[PDB]
Amino acid sequence: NLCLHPEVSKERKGTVVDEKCRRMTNGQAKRKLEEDPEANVELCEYHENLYNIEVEDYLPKGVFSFEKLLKYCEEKTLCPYFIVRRMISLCNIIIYSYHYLLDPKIAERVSNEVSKDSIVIFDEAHNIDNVCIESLSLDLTTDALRRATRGANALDERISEVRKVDSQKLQDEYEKLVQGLHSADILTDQEEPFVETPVLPQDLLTEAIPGNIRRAEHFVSFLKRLIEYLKTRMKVLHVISETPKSFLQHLKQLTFIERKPLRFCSERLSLLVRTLEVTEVEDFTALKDIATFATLISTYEEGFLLIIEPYEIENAAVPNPIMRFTCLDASIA
Amino acid sequence: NKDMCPICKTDRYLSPDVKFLVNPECYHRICESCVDRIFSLGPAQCPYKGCDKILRKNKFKTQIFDDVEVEKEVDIRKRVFNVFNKTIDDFNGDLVEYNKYLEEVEDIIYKLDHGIDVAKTEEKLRTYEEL
Amino acid sequence: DRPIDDIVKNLLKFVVRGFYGGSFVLVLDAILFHSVLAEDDLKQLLSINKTELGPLIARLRSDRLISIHKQREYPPNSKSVERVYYYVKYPHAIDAIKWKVHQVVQRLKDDLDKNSEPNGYMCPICLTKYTQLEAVQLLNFDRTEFLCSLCDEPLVEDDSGKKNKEKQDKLNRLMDQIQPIIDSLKKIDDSRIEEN
Amino acid sequence: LSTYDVHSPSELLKLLRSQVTFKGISCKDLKDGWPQCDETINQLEEDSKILVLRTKKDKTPRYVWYNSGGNLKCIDEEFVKMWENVQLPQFAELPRKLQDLGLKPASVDPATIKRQKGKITNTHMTGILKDYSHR
Amino acid sequence: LRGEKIMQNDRGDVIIDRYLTLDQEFDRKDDDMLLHPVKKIIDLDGNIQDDPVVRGNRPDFTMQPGVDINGNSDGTVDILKGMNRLSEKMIMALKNEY
Numbered sequence: 001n002l003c004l005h006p007e008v009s010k011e012r013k014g015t016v017v018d019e020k021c022r023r024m025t026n027g028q029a030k031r032k033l034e035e036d037p038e039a040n041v042e043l044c045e046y047h048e049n050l051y052n053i054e055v056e057d058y059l060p061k062g063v064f065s066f067e068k069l070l071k072y073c074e075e076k077t078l079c080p081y082f083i084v085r086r087m088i089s090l091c092n093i094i095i096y097s098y099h100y101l102l103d104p105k106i107a108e109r110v111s112n113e114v115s116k117d118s119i120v121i122f123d124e125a126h127n128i129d130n131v132c133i134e135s136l137s138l139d140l141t142t143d144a145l146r147r148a149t150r151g152a153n154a155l156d157e158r159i160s161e162v163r164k165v166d167s168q169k170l171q172d173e174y175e176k177l178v179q180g181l182h183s184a185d186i187l188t189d190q191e192e193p194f195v196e197t198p199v200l201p202q203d204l205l206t207e208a209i210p211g212n213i214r215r216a217e218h219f220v221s222f223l224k225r226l227i228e229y230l231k232t233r234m235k236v237l238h239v240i241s242e243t244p245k246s247f248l249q250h251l252k253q254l255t256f257i258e259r260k261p262l263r264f265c266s267e268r269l270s271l272l273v274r275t276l277e278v279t280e281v282e283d284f285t286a287l288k289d290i291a292t293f294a295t296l297i298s299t300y301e302e303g304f305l306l307i308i309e310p311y312e313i314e315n316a317a318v319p320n321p322i323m324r325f326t327c328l329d330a331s332i333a
Numbered sequence: 334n335k336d337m338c339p340i341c342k343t344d345r346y347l348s349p350d351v352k353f354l355v356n357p358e359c360y361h362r363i364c365e366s367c368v369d370r371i372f373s374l375g376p377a378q379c380p381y382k383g384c385d386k387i388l389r390k391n392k393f394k395t396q397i398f399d400d401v402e403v404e405k406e407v408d409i410r411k412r413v414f415n416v417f418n419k420t421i422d423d424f425n426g427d428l429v430e431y432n433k434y435l436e437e438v439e440d441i442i443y444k445l446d447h448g449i450d451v452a453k454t455e456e457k458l459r460t461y462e463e464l
Numbered sequence: 465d466r467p468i469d470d471i472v473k474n475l476l477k478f479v480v481r482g483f484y485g486g487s488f489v490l491v492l493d494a495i496l497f498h499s500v501l502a503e504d505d506l507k508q509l510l511s512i513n514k515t516e517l518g519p520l521i522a523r524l525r526s527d528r529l530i531s532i533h534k535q536r537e538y539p540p541n542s543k544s545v546e547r548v549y550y551y552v553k554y555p556h557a558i559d560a561i562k563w564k565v566h567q568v569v570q571r572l573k574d575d576l577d578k579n580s581e582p583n584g585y586m587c588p589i590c591l592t593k594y595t596q597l598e599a600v601q602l603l604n605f606d607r608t609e610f611l612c613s614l615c616d617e618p619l620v621e622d623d624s625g626k627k628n629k630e631k632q633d634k635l636n637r638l639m640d641q642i643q644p645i646i647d648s649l650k651k652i653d654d655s656r657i658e659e660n
Numbered sequence: 661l662s663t664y665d666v667h668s669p670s671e672l673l674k675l676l677r678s679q680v681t682f683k684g685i686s687c688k689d690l691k692d693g694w695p696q697c698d699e700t701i702n703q704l705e706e707d708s709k710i711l712v713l714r715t716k717k718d719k720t721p722r723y724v725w726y727n728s729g730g731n732l733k734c735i736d737e738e739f740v741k742m743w744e745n746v747q748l749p750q751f752a753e754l755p756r757k758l759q760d761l762g763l764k765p766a767s768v769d770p771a772t773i774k775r776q777k778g779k780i781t782n783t784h785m786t787g788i789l790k791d792y793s794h795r
Numbered sequence: 796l797r798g799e800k801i802m803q804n805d806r807g808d809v810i811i812d813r814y815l816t817l818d819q820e821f822d823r824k825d826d827d828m829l830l831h832p833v834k835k836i837i838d839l840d841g842n843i844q845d846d847p848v849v850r851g852n853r854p855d856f857t858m859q860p861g862v863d864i865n866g867n868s869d870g871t872v873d874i875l876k877g878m879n880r881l882s883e884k885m886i887m888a889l890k891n892e893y
C-alpha cells in the first residue's frame with residue numbers, strides 16, 4: 001500500500017513485494033555494490049535517499065494521511081513505508097490495523113517501538129476475536145507438503161554447493177550458535193528474519209539451540225523427515241482431531257523428534273537461509289509454512305486442536321486431504 | 334518402478350491385492366509374491382542387477398515414509414538411539430554437555446548413512462554398547 | 465462421438481493386430497469402419513470366399529470381440545431370407561480382453577513360480593513323472609537311486625532347472641509389449657461406456 | 661491411362677487413406693501401368709503402413725487397405741499361443757469373476773436385465789362434449 | 796450477452812458461436828480499460844493485503860465460488876462479472892467528451 005518503486009509496486013502479491021523490497025534493501029546488495037561497483041545488483045533510490053536526511057526530519061510536523069504522505073514522498077523521492085515505520089517512536093498517535101497488534105508475525109517488531117504507557121483504543125472491536133483466533137492458526141495441504149520436500153531437496157543441494165566453494169561461511173554461524181546467540185543477536189536491524197516468529201514472543205525459548213539442528217546438514221535431515229511424517233498423516237481416510245501433545249508423541253515414536261527442536265525450527269531455518277545468501281527464495285517459500293507449523297505445535301499445548309480431514313471440499317471426485325492447526329482460545333493472542 | 338514389481342512386473346491395476354516390502358539391507362522394493370517365491374526357501378542374492386548383498390526373508394518389513402532416503406536415516410537412527418540412550422538429567426543439568434552429546438550422535442548417524450567411516454563408526458558404536 | 469469411443473476403437477485395433485493374424489485385422493477393421501456389416505457385404509469388401517471368412521468370424525465370436533444378430537427380411541420381390549449382421553459389443557469386448565490379459569499374465573506368473581520349485585523326476589521308459597516327495601519313497605534298499613514302480617528302473621532327473629531366467633524374461637517381454645492395452649484399459653475404466 | 665495414377669509409395673498411401681469405404685483396391689488393376697509395384701507393396705507391409713491380403717498358392721500381393729492402427733506385428737509368437745490357449749469363461753459368469761479378481765467389469769450379467777355404469781339420461785348431447793376428466 | 800447462464804452446449808448457431816472467442820477478447824479488453832486506481836478510502840485490495848503474511852485457516856466452501864465435482868468453476872461468477880461490466884459500461888459511457 002506504500003511502495004513507490006515502479007517495478008516492485010506493480011506486483012500483485014504483498015509477499016512478493018516484500019521479497020523484492022527486502023532484496024533491494026536487505027543491505028547485502030549495498031555492501032556488494034560498495035565492494036565492487038561493477039556488480040549489477042540494483043538498489044532502491046527511495047530507500048537510499050532516507051540515509052541523507054535525519055530520522056526526525058523525514059516529514060514536516062503534522063498529521064500525514066496515506067494520500068498526503070504518498071504525495072509528499074513522491075515529490076521528495078522517499079519511501080513512505082520506511083518513513084512511517086521509522087517514525088513510530090516520534091508519533092503521538094499511531095493508527096494501524098489489529099493485525100499489527102495481535103498477529104505475532106508482524107507485531108513483535110512494531111510492539112517494541114510503541115510506548116508502554118500509551119492509550120490503546122480498539123475501534124469496531126466487535127470482530128476482534130476472529131483476528132485473535134486467525135493469528136495462531138495454519139492450514140497445510142498436500143501441495144504445501146510436496147513443495148516442502150522440493151524446498152528441502154533444493155536446500156540440501158545449495159548447502160553442498162556452498163560447502164564445495166567455501167565452507168567458512170557456515171563455520172562462523174555454527175560457532176555463534178554454540179555460543180548461544182540467537183537470530184536477534186546474529187541478524188542486524190536492517191536485515192529481517194526469513195521466517196517471522198509465528199509464536200508469541202513470550203513463549204519463545206531462551207536457551208541455546210538443541211544441537212541436533214546446529215549443523216546445516218543435520219537440520220536439513222531434521223526438516224526432511226518431519227515433512228515426510230506430515231505426508232504420512234495426510235493419508236487418513238477419516239476425520240481425526242487430536243491435541244498437540246498427542247501429535248508430538250506420535251511424531252516422536254515414529255521419527256525421533258522431540259518438542260524442543262521443533263520450537264527452534266523457525267529460528268534455525270532463518271539463520272540457514274541467511275548464511276546461504278540465496279538470491280532467490282521462490283522455491284524455499286514452501287518451507288516457511290512447515291517451519292511455522294513446527295513452532296506453533298511445539299510451543300502451545302492447551303487451546304489448540306489439530307484436525308485432519310481427507311475431504312476439504314466434500315463435493316470433490318478425488319479427496320484432497322488438508323490438516324488444520326486451529327486455535328480455539330481467542331484470549332491467547 | 335512406479336506401481337509394479339521391478340522383478341515380475343506385476344501391475345497394481347491387474348492385481349490390486351499386490352503389496353510391496355523392503356529389506357533394511359539395501360532398501361529395494363519388491364512385491365510379497367516375489368519374496369515368498371525367492372526368500373521362503375532360504376537366503377539368496379537380491380534380484381537386482383549390480384546388487385549382491387545377501388538378505389534374509391524375515392528381515393523384510395513394510396515401508397512407512399515414501400522417501401526411501403528418509404527411511405534409511407530413521408532406521409539407522411533407530412539402531413543408534415537403541416545404543417545411545419541419555420537425557421538431560423544424565424548430565425546433571427549441564428546443557429552444554431547435553432547439546433554436544435546430541436551433536437556427536439547426529440554426526441554418527443550422518444556418517445553411517447553416507448558410509449564415510451562405516452568401519453570406524455561401527456567399531457565405536459559396538460564399544461559403547463558393551464560399555 | 466466422445467473420445468472414449470476412439471480409445472476403445474484403438475484398443476480393439478491393437479489387440480487384433482497383436483494377438484491375431486492378418487485376415488482377422490481385415491474383418492474386424494471393416495466392422496469398425498462400418499458399424500454393422502452384413503455377411504454378404506463383408507465378403508465383397510474383403511474379396512474372401514465363405515470358407516476363408518469362416519474361421520475368422522467364428523474365432524472372433526468365440527472371444528466375443530464381435531456379436532451376431534439374425535433377423536428375417538422380406539424383400540419386395542424375393543423370398544423371405546434370414547440375414548446375418550456383425551457388430552461390436554464394446555462392454556463384452558473390453559471385459560473379454562481384460563480377463564484374457566489377466567489370465568495370460570497369471571499363467572506366466574504361475575509358471576515362473578513353479579519353475580523355482582525343485583525339478584522332480586521322470587522315468588525314461590514309461591515317461592511317468594515323479595515329484596521330489598513322491599520319488600523319495602521309491603529309493604532302493606541301497607539308498608543309491610530311485611526306482612520306478614512300473615518299470616523297476618532308475619529314475620532320471622527332470623529338466624527346466626536353468627530356465628528360471630528364461631521365464632522371467634518372457635514375463636518382462638509380455639508386460640513391455642502389453643503396456644498399451646493396460647493404459648487403454650485404465651482410460652476406459654475411468655469413463656463409462658453404454659452398451660451397444 | 662492407368663486406372664490409378666500411382667507410381668510412388670507416397671502416392672499410394674494418399675490414395676488408400678482417401679478411400680471413403682473399406683473396399684480394397686486390386687493390386688492386379690493397380691499394377692497395370694506400373695512397371696514394378698510388388699516390391700513397393702512388400703516394403704510398405706514391412707513398414708506396417710498398409711494392410712495387405714496375399715494369395716495362398718504363393719505369397720503374392722492382392723487387395724490392400726490403409727492401416728489405421730499401430731504396428732501389424734508387435735507380439736511374440738509365444739504370447740499369441742498363450743492368448744489362444746486361454747478359454748473365455750461363461751458369457752453370463754464373466755462379470756462375476758472379474759469383480760472377484762478385483763477388476764472393475766465393463767459388462768453385466770444379461771440375467772440381471774429387466775424387460776419393460778348406469779344409464780346416461782343426458783341423451784341428445786352425448787357426443788358433442790369432450791371428457792375433461794382433469795382440469 | 797444478457798447474462799443467462801451458459802447451459803450445456805445447445806444448438807445455438809454455427810456462425811455466431813464462432814464470434815464467442817472474439818467477444819471474450821473484447822470483454823477482457825473492456826475489463827482492462829475499466830480497471831484503474833481506486834480511491835484509498837473505499838479501496839478493498841489494500842484491506843486484504845494489509846497483512847501479507849497472514850496464513851490463517853482457509854474458509855469453508857460457503858465463502859468460495861461454487862465448484863463442480865471435477866473441480867471446474869460452476870460458472871455463476873461469470874454471469875455476476877457480466878452484471879458488473881454492464882453497469883460499469885453504462886456509467887462510464889455517461890462521462891463522454893460532450
Ligand code: SF4
Pocket residue numbers: 002003004005008009020021022024025044046047079080081082
Ligand atoms: S524501499 Fe519502499 S519504494 Fe523501495 S521497494 Fe521497498 S517499499 Fe517499495
Ligand SMILES: [Zn+2]
Pocket residue numbers: 338339340341342343363364365366367
Ligand atoms: Zn514381484
Ligand SMILES: [Zn+2]
Pocket residue numbers: 359361379380381384385386
Ligand atoms: Zn538389493
Ligand SMILES: [Zn+2]
Pocket residue numbers: 587588589590591592612613614615616617
Ligand atoms: Zn517307468
